[PDB]
Amino acid sequence: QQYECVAEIGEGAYGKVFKARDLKNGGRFVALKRVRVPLSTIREVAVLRHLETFEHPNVVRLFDVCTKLTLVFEHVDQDLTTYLDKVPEPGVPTETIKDMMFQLLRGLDFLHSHRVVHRDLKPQNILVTSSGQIKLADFGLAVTLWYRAPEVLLQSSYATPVDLWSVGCIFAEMFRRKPLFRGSSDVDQLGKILDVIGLPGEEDWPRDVALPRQAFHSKSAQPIEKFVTDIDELGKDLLLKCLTFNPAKRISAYSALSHPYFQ
Ligand SMILES: CC(C)n1c(C(C)(C)O)nc2c(F)cc(-c3nc(N[C@@H]4CCOC[C@H]4O)ncc3Cl)cc21
């Protein structure tokens, strides 16, 4: 074969991910994902090959697609989790947090501009290069709810704002070095969220959903500086705009890119 598996990276629905040697390309390490067997998946791979044409700096490269289906991607040694685990005290430098957030928002804006939603953005799929470059991986194909948006938990809407909530969760975790909302179920997750952001107005609660607003009594919203201690005034504002309950009022990746926090 042209690829030689050396280790298992992970397991997905229904497929395994393997670290492989690209024998025809200098034995470079590659991530091989096998997708089992449709037309929707054919379209999904077509979107991924199209996004590759733009070769965005903040998205993992798709080197090859073979025919059930093998997806060959560039290998990145570490994810944001392993970076946050190994970063020395007192934590990630303020300007490293800033740069990585801009790169994440750049890759996110790229995907949203091409009508692609990640839907499972988490430090495990955010890859960090030896040069410190953020690369998005593990998206475009069809459990941890710590980054799941409230409208996904409530089962009402599944648009792009879902990823911006995950970014707000990730932004907070870059300072904390531990997840912001560590729920253990959809109802626990939403409760743990509303303890911090407060119960939203009745007009901001999704209509025709199973869980009503009155199923929670989180009462008032607490200051974020308590849960994220070293955040600046501008960072606090960007973080709040991401962690907005109502997805229509939540900042977009495009307007987050222009926030004064990045000036
Ligand atoms: C693991 C997970 C995020 N993952 C999943 C599933 C479906 C399991 O969630 N599919 C994945 C996939 F298609 C590719 C990668 C990927 N991984 C690396 N490197 C890894 C990063 C983690 O540390 C070990 C390194 O070797 N480099 C490049 C890519 Cl693109 C990760 C995937």
From Swiss-Prot:
InterPro entries: CDK, CDK6, Kinase-like_dom_sf, Prot_kinase_dom, Protein_kinase_ATP_BS, Ser/Thr_kinase_AS
Entry keyword 4Fe-4S: no
Annotated gene: CDK6
Residues with PTM Phosphotyrosine: 3, 14
Reaction equations catalysed: L-seryl-[protein] + ATP = O-phospho-L-seryl-[protein] + ADP + H(+); L-threonyl-[protein] + ATP = O-phospho-L-threonyl-[protein] + ADP + H(+)
Protein name per its UniProtKB record: Cyclin-dependent kinase 6
Record: disease: Microcephaly 12, primary, autosomal recessive: A form of microcephaly, a disease defined as a head circumference more than 3 standard deviations below the age-related mean. Brain weight is markedly reduced and the cerebral cortex is disproportionately small.
PROSITE patterns: PROTEIN_KINASE_ATP, PROTEIN_KINASE_DOM, PROTEIN_KINASE_ST
Pfam families: Pkinase (PF00069)
Main localization category: cytoplasm
Residues with the N6-acetyllysine modification: 226
Species whose genome carries this gene: Homo sapiens
Subcellular location(s) per record: Cytoplasm; Nucleus; Cell projection, Ruffle; Cytoplasm, Cytoskeleton, Microtubule organizing center, Centrosome
SUPFAM superfamilies: Protein kinase-like (PK-like)
Inducing or repressing factors: Down-regulated in response to enterovirus 71 (EV71) infection. Induced by NANOG during S-phase entry.
